[PDB]
Amino acid sequence: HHCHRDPLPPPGLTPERLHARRQLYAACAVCFVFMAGEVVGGYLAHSLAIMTDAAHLLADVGSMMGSLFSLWLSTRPATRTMTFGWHRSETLGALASVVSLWMVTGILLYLAFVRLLHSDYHIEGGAMLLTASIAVCANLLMAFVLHQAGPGNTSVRAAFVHVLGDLLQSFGVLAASILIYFKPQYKAADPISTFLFSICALGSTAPTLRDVLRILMEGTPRNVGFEPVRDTLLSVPGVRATHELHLWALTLTYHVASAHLAIDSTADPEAVLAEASSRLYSRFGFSSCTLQVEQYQPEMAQCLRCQEPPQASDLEVLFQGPEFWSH
Amino acid sequence: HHCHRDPLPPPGLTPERLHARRQLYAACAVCFVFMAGEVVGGYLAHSLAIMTDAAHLLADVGSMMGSLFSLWLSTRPATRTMTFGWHRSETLGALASVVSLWMVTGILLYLAFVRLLHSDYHIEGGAMLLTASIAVCANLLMAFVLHTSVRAAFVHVLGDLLQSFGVLAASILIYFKPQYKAADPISTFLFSICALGSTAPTLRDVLRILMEGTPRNVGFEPVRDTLLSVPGVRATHELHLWALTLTYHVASAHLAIDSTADPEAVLAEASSRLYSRFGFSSCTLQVEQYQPEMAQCLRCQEPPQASDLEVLFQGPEFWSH
Ligand SMILES: CCCCCCCCCCC(CCCCCCCCCC)(CO[C@@H]1O[C@H](CO)[C@@H](O[C@H]2O[C@H](CO)[C@@H](O)[C@H](O)[C@H]2O)[C@H](O)[C@H]1O)CO[C@@H]1O[C@H](CO)[C@@H](O[C@H]2O[C@H](CO)[C@@H](O)[C@H](O)[C@H]2O)[C@H](O)[C@H]1O
Ligand SMILES: CCCCCCCCCCC(CCCCCCCCCC)(CO[C@@H]1O[C@H](CO)[C@@H](O[C@H]2O[C@H](CO)[C@@H](O)[C@H](O)[C@H]2O)[C@H](O)[C@H]1O)CO[C@@H]1O[C@H](CO)[C@@H](O[C@H]2O[C@H](CO)[C@@H](O)[C@H](O)[C@H]2O)[C@H](O)[C@H]1O
Ligand SMILES: CC(C)CCC[C@@H](C)[C@H]1CC[C@H]2[C@@H]3CC=C4C[C@@H](OC(=O)CCC(=O)O)CC[C@]4(C)[C@H]3CC[C@]12C
Ligand SMILES: CC(C)CCC[C@@H](C)[C@H]1CC[C@H]2[C@@H]3CC=C4C[C@@H](OC(=O)CCC(=O)O)CC[C@]4(C)[C@H]3CC[C@]12C
Ligand SMILES: [Zn+2]
Ligand SMILES: [Zn+2]
Ligand SMILES: [Zn+2]
Ligand SMILES: [Zn+2]
Ligand SMILES: [Zn+2]
Ligand SMILES: [Zn+2]
């Protein structure tokens, strides 16, 4: 046919999409209510380790909100001001969740630093122990529910690992609470625990921001490489040297490509165009590929704007920057 | 030429860029010194209007740093993983500045609400008056030094000069009558609301640019009409035009041509018309035979005339289900 060959038609209200959104807000509601209970307990206990656990629960709630808004907004069609669509809402929500986690972790880190230096605080061991045990039981209940509700095919399995990690962190906080309750004169255990767990949370959120910032710079997607795309385009019969090969990603799974193709004077543009588009779709699954077909016009051999970028890496290409810094 | 007519290949380093480099360093150093003075004064006096002034200076310094890093990055060429270049550093720096402003002003609102509720804080009137007077004097000195980016700097300095006259008025009122201690939280509240109202439009523009949205200056209808005006075109579909920054615009579209039209002629005419009329920094358009099956095909139909709010209002049916 035409550029619609083997195209996946995206509907609005997919029943699988409805199931996903249903389980998503169920998990979100459970996380929010248990976060509320746990933060009330932490405010009662005047501690900060369970405050770090509540911050982690807040991060989980924010991530679920970001996923839910993205899921809803993906159903809406592309408009005259959002011609690509509302896909990048997922990336923006991920960045917002990371920023919120950074803010809360920084606030808690500053509070822990103040508590460590001033060392003027009292901790209610009776309340802290009860609320930490409640959190541990909550994580165990969530894990048991997820295992029982498993074998949505991959969502439950993906959530199970995170529940296990939260359970391990809850065991850490519970051990800190035991140490504080049995020996109240070790009251500095709570700031140390919250400091270490905030550092761990920042380390865990470090890699999920690199991908978001790489996407939000119109950068090449991690999965798809420039070299395979260029080789695939050049391997199409009748194709000479190409230029202006722009390919980027709207999200982790939505990849868009664009290129200029220079063909021989004896090659039919339609056939080579269709072959290149089909090859790109089959090999890489680009969700949108609008490539331009031109005659060779040998004058581009001397054109500086038609030269492909060098194989230098991002870290390497920025090492000549200090020349501008020095000046 | 072929497709790069009027290439405009900007040099990596230009003397104007070095001049902007020197100007930005001077401004950033002055603003950082003024930040140091303001924060020391506020910490000494245990006030909060000085903290709001320091927050605005933090926003200004963040804007300076973002603009300077963007200027540095614009020099660097396109990389095999950054094929579009480092252009969107402008947008990311603006977003970072706005986010930092929002976080700092949220902390300040929290502190102001706590101070208003507890109503127990001993603030030294003399020290806070001294730092407010120093801030006003420094802002007037910068205005006098300032006597393009120069006009924008002058109007921003005037705005901040009124911003600091607010602090000076609050300071003289609290110093003349120590009883009116509660004027500081009100001043901080009003000042922060003004800052939020000022910083909302830039956040909206940055979010529109990041979401691959159509740039405000360029309209979908003029581009569609221009692409349909060239002879030999009957179906423009999958038009995708977005913007890396406020000034960098990228466009991409199909062009369905009939069997009687030369693809290169219409391609060159459309590219020239787009570059001349809208100034697109990169236009990559695809030419195809009309293939009348496109008349009944589904996703090669133009999106309907509807605003972003209008289309989103049909969304609420999703949640109920
Ligand atoms: C009624 C029961 C069913 C409920 C199931 C619904 C839950 C779905 C969310 C699971 C979740 C919530 C955490 C659950 C806490 C409590 C939940 C349950 C408690 C209440 C009963 C935790 O998922 C975990 O998050 C961790 C954070 O990375 C991470 O861990 C791992 O990564 C480490 C490196 O990162 C590494 O070391 C190691 O590989 C792991 O450690 C993994 O992402 C994952 O294990 C969110 O993370 C998921 O991550 C996916 C890609 O990120 C993404 O999935 C999709 O979402 C939409 C779906 O269609 C849809 O838009 C998309 O397909 C997609 O975007 C979403 O972001 C989010 O869904
Ligand atoms: C020793 C000499 C130093 C001279 C300083 C030169 C620095 C120039 C920066 C001035 C600045 C900070 C101002 C802080 C003042 C400094 C205080 C102390 C300094 C004195 C020691 C003004 O900041 C803007 O000013 C606008 C006008 O005030 C105003 O916007 C609103 O208010 C108006 C009503 O006021 C009203 O019309 C309207 O509602 C709005 O318009 C806002 O204040 C604010 O957005 C920076 O932002 C400006 O905006 C540009 C995009 O950000 C930016 O250009 C960039 O693009 C270039 C090409 O793409 C490229 O080259 C670079 O990417 C970069 O340049 C410029 O940098 C600058 O033009
Ligand atoms: C803690 C949780 C609740 C956060 C959820 C994630 C958000 C950061 C996401 C959810 C949906 C996203 C929004 C979806 C739609 C738009 C519209 C878009 O605005 C326009 O196109 C302007 C239209 C106009 O003003 O006419 C700007 C980005 C924005 C606000 C997105 C920015 C990021 C948002 C707010
Ligand atoms: C003093 C503070 C409060 C002011 C704000 C700090 C700025 C100097 C920061 C804010 C956001 C930063 C930008 C955010 C993201 C990026 C992407 C980053 O691109 C990458 O190479 C990452 C992705 C990849 O490796 O592919 C380059 C630096 C840059 C422009 C950052 C430069 C430094 C900026 C402007
Ligand atoms: Zn097409
Ligand atoms: Zn979790
Ligand atoms: Zn060329
Ligand atoms: Zn070309
Ligand atoms: Zn200012
Ligand atoms: Zn079609």
Numbering used by the authors:
A (entry chain B): 53 to 203, 228 to 403
B (entry chain A): 53 to 199, 230 to 403
Sentences from the paper on this structure:
ZnT/SLC30 transporters are major players in regulating zinc homeostasis, by harnessing the proton gradient to mobilize the divalent cationic zinc across membranes. ZIPs increase the cytosolic Zn2+ by either importing from the extracellular space or releasing the stored Zn2+ from subcellular compartments, whereas ZnTs remove Zn2+ out of the cytoplasm and maintain physiologically low free Zn2+. ZnT/YiiP mediated Zn2+ transport is mainly powered by proton gradient. Here we determined four high-resolution structures of the plasma-specific hZnT1 and the synaptic vesicle-specific hZnT3.
To validate if the hZnT1 conformational dynamics obtained at low pH is generally adopted by ZnTs, we sought to characterize a second ZnT family member, the synaptic vesicle-specific zinc transporter ZnT3. We prepared hZnT3 in the same low pH buffer as for hZnT1, and successfully obtained a 3.14-Å resolution V-shaped map which permitted the modeling of an IF/IF homodimer, with zinc ions identified at TMD binding sites. Extra densities were also observed, including an extended density lying along the cleft between the two protomers, and branched densities wedged in the TMDs. We tentatively assigned a phosphoethanolamine molecule (PE) for the elongated density, and the lauryl maltose neopentyl glycol (LMNG) detergent for the branched density. The artificial engagement of LMNG with TMDs is unexpected, especially it is situated right beneath the STM Zn2+-binding site. This interaction may lock TMD in the inward-facing state and could partially explain why we could not capture different conformations driven by protons at low pH condition. Although the V-shaped architecture with two splayed TMDs is similar to its closest paralog hZnT8, some specific features are observed only in hZnT3. In contrast, this interface Zn2+ site is not preserved in hZnT3, and the His345 is replaced by a serine (Ser363) at an equivalent position on CTD. Mutation of the residue Arg286 close to the PE head group modestly reduced the Zn2+ transport activity, without significant alterations to ZnT3 expression or localization. Despite different dimerization patterns observed in the tightly bound torpedo-shaped hZnT1 and the splayed V-shaped hZnT3 IF/IF homodimers, their TMDs actually can be well aligned, suggesting a conserved transport mechanism among ZnT/YiiP family.
